[PDB]
Amino acid sequence: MIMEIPAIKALSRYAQWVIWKKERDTKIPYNPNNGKKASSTDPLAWGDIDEAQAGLVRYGANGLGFVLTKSDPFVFIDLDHVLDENKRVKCEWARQLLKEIKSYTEISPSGDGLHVVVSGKLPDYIKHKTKFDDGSALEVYESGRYMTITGEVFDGRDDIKELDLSILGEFAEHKILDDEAIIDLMKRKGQWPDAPKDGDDWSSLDMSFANRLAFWCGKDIERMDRIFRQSPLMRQKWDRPTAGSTYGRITLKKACDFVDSVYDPALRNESDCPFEPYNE
Numbered sequence: 001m002i003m004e005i006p007a008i009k010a011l012s013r014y015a016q017w018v019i020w021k022k023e024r025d026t027k028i029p030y031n032p033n034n035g036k037k038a039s040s041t042d043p044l045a046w047g048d049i050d051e052a053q054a055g056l057v058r059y060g061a062n063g064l065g066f067v068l069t070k071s072d073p074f075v076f077i078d079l080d081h082v083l084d085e086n087k088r089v090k091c092e093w094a095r096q097l098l099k100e101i102k103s104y105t106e107i108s109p110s111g112d113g114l115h116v117v118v119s120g121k122l123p124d125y126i127k128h129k130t131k132f133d134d135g136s137a138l139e140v141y142e143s144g145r146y147m148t149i150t151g152e153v154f155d156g157r158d159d160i161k162e163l164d165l166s167i168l169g170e171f172a173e174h175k176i177l178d179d180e181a182i183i184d185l186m187k188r189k190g191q192w193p194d195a196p197k198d199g200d201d202w203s204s205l206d207m208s209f210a211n212r213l214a215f216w217c218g219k220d221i222e223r224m225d226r227i228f229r230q231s232p233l234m235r236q237k238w239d240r241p242t243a244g245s246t247y248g249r250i251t252l253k254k255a256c257d258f259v260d261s262v263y264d265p266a267l268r269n270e271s272d273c274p275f276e277p278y279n280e
């Protein structure tokens with residue numbers, strides 16, 4: 001019955017289909033022809049819709065997916081946690097977006113979200129992901145991404161439409177070594193902290209982790225801060241004022257004065273790190 005939907009017929013023109021399966025709370029995309037993990041950049045890792053339907057039953061995956069590319073005309077709008085227990089919209093922002101972007105809408109696989117597929121072009125000044133106090137989120141992509149396909153047509157909106165997408169500027173937020181290189185380096189060296197557990201002096205985990213950052217970042221106080229904000233030790237206390245400074249900066253500066261050596265990127269002195277790896 002899926003191939004009856006006009007929008008699914010439109011997507012089946014493209015050999016950009018995959019299948020996905022729930023690992024933990026992630027949704028990994030897989031090559032429908034052989035079952036390997038599918039890249040989002042390798043077109044030969046995908047298949048057409050017939051191969052995705054066949055591969056779905058073969059490996060028992062959770063459902064179909066569609067990879068978005070620059071040259072196809074589609075735009076993927078992801079609305080998370082915007083539906084009731086009986087699948088009506090409970091967020092007023094999502095209610096207004098659906099009024100001004102009337103195109104193919106379907107219920108996402110968790111039942112509490114929506115997908116809208118539109119032909120158009122995204123504004124270049126908006127963030128990919130926008131999070132709201134409500135707990136909902138708006139995530140938009142036109143390439144370098146795949147979308148789960150359910151066919152659960154919402155509100156009978158079963159047709160991809162050609163719409164202007166400047167209206168998204170009213171919903172998404174606007175937007176104007178290497179940090180990730182250091183993060184991966186610290187992870188591989190066993191120096192990336194685990195999330196704090198019950199009965200853990202979080203403030204003491206902060207300081208220990210901040211000491212390591214002082215080494216691996218070369219006491220680059222602004223880099224240590226950018227990296228700390230992506231760690232499982234980040235919390236609202238980090239930016240609370242304390243004596244004409246924030247708790248986060250007082251921690252980072254204390255670490256910079258505590259640590260003696262520094263990791264020189266050009267010297268590879270990983271053996272100079274004075275802190276033992278995080279046990280597992």
Ligand SMILES: Nc1nc2c(ncn2[C@H]2C[C@H](O)[C@@H](COP(=O)(O)OP(=O)(O)OP(=O)(O)O)O2)c(=O)[nH]1
Nearest residue numbers: 026027028078080108109110111113145146147148
């Ligand atoms: N897990 C995962 N998802 C990806 C990747 N590239 C694109 N995606 C897609 C699959 C998802 O449909 C899309 C949005 O993520 P979501 O958390 O919102 O899952 P989805 O909307 O499909 O269902 P749900 O929100 O839980 O109701 O991101 C990837 O490398 N890993």
Ligand SMILES: [Mg+2]
Nearest residue numbers: 078079080113
């Ligand atoms: Mg979603």
Ligand SMILES: [Mg+2]
Nearest residue numbers: 069072074142
């Ligand atoms: Mg596209």
